[PDB]
Amino acid sequence: IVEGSDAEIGMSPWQVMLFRKSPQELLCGASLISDRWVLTAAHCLLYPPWDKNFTENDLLVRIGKHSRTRYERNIEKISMLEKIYIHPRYNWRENLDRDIALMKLKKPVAFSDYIHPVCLPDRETAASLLQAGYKGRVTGWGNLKEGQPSVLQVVNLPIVERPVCKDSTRIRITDNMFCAGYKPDEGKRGDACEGDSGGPFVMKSPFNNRWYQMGIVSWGEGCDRDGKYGFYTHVFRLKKWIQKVIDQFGE
Amino acid sequence: XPXX
Amino acid sequence: ADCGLRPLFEKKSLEDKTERELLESYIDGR
Ligand SMILES: *[C@@H]1O[C@H](CO)[C@@H](O)[C@H](O)[C@H]1NC(C)=O
Ligand SMILES: [Cl-]
Ligand code: NA
């Protein structure tokens, strides 16, 4: 996270760290959507142009963390993965369309003060909240500049008008993505960056005071560059797939 | 390109 | 179900340091 600040303790209790077993390293962010399902970006798990294709046994998730590096015996839970599900129409070859994956844990995680699931938006919440100029929040342990934080970082960023998102890049954007960040004329900064990938873009609903995950950190060109914006997987538009997976493979 |  | 309500914030009637920026964007952002 570029131009953010340290999270408060328990501020993002759905934040998940995707961790490589060998060598031991942070791979990505992710989010807790129930006691046994975790949401992330497909490109965190599968990206053939970089020879990336993880299997379940290659990875762990770490839930309830604050420190990037310390083992938080008190508060974090480390879980194994039962199965990875990648959207079948994830378009890694072109534009990262449908950049979304689910991971089922080998056993349910107990919720605590530090571990708690985020909501997924319904259609009307998405329609109402995902509008240009409204702000959401991104969290992660990724780079501080295009340089790693000690603890989880947070930044709030405005959703950007689709034509502005489109004109900012030559990548072929789709309706399964949105972009967020300040415009040069707004005189403020901030972005997600490498290592934040797969983590959540959330909004606090004014209708029911609950936090909803609207996006997944997906792609960008550099980090925090003027006239560039971070791109996020549009969670509501991919919710039909999430529901199909969970219905078939078991809540 | 990808977040990475 | 209980999703999206944080034990250390909403459940204790406590606000985090920047959530009001999100709420205010609903007033001023459009
Ligand atoms: C990824 O690896 C699995 C084996 O773990 C293989 O079956 C699959 O074909 C690979 N996927 C791609 C698109 O390379
Ligand atoms: Cl300007
Ligand atoms: Na920018």
Numbering used by the authors:
A (entry chain H): 321 to 466, 475 to 579
B (entry chain I): 1 to 4
C (entry chain L): 291 to 320
The authors write:
All the inhibitors bind in a substrate-like orientation to the active site of the enzyme, forming an antiparallel β-sheet with the Ser214-Gly216 segment of α-thrombin. In the fPrt complex, the carbonyl oxygen of d-Arg (P1) establishes water-mediated interactions with thrombin residues Glu192 (Glu192 N) and Gly219 (Gly219 O). When d-Thr is found in the P1′ position (fPrt), the inhibitor is stabilized by water-mediated hydrogen bonds between its OG and Lys60F NZ, Leu41 O and Cys58 O and between its terminal amide nitrogen and Asn143 OD1 and Trp141 O. Additionally, fPrt interacts directly with thrombin through hydrogen bonds between its d-Thr carbonyl oxygen and both Gly193 N and the hydroxyl group of the catalytic Ser195. A d-Thr N - His57 NE2 interaction is observed as well, resembling that found in complexes of thrombin with active site inhibitors with benzothiazole and ketothiazole or with bivalent inhibitors with α-keto-amide or 2-(4-aminobutyl)-hydrazyde (Abh) at the P1′ position. Furthermore, d-Thr makes hydrophobic contacts with Trp60D, His57 and with the Cys42-Cys58 disulfide bond. All these interactions could be maintained in the case of d-Val at position P1′, except for the solvent-mediated contacts established by the side chain hydroxyl group of threonine, possibly accounting for the 2-fold lower Ki displayed by fPrt. However, in the fPrC and fPrt complexes, the Ser195 side chain is rotated away from the catalytic histidine residue, therefore disrupting the canonical hydrogen bond, and interacts instead with the carbonyl oxygen of the P1′ residue. We suggest that the catalytic triad disruption in thrombin∶fPrC and thrombin∶fPrt impairs the enzyme's hydrolytic ability, as proton abstraction by His57 NE2 and activation of Ser195 OG is no longer possible. In the thrombin∶fPrt and thrombin∶fPrC complexes, the side chain of Lys60F is found in an extended conformation similar to that observed in the thrombin-PPACK model and in the unliganded enzyme.
Prevention of pathological clot formation can be achieved by specifically inhibiting the serine proteinase α-thrombin, an enzyme that occupies a central role in the blood coagulation cascade, where it plays both pro and anticoagulant roles. In an attempt to discover new anticoagulants with lower risk of bleeding, a new generation of peptidic DTI derived from the d-Phe-Pro-d-Arg tripeptide scaffold was developed. The three-dimensional structures of three complexes of human α-thrombin with peptide inhibitors (general sequence d-Phe-Pro-d-Arg-P1′-CONH2 with l-isoleucine (fPrI), l-cysteine (fPrC) or d-threonine (fPrt) at the P1′ position) were determined by X-ray crystallography. The structure of the proteinase in all the complexes is very similar to that of the unliganded enzyme (248 Cα atoms of the heavy chain of thrombin can be aligned with a r.m.s.d. of 0.22, 0.17 and 0.12 Å for fPrI, fPrC and fPrt, respectively), with minor changes mostly in the side chain conformation of specific residues.
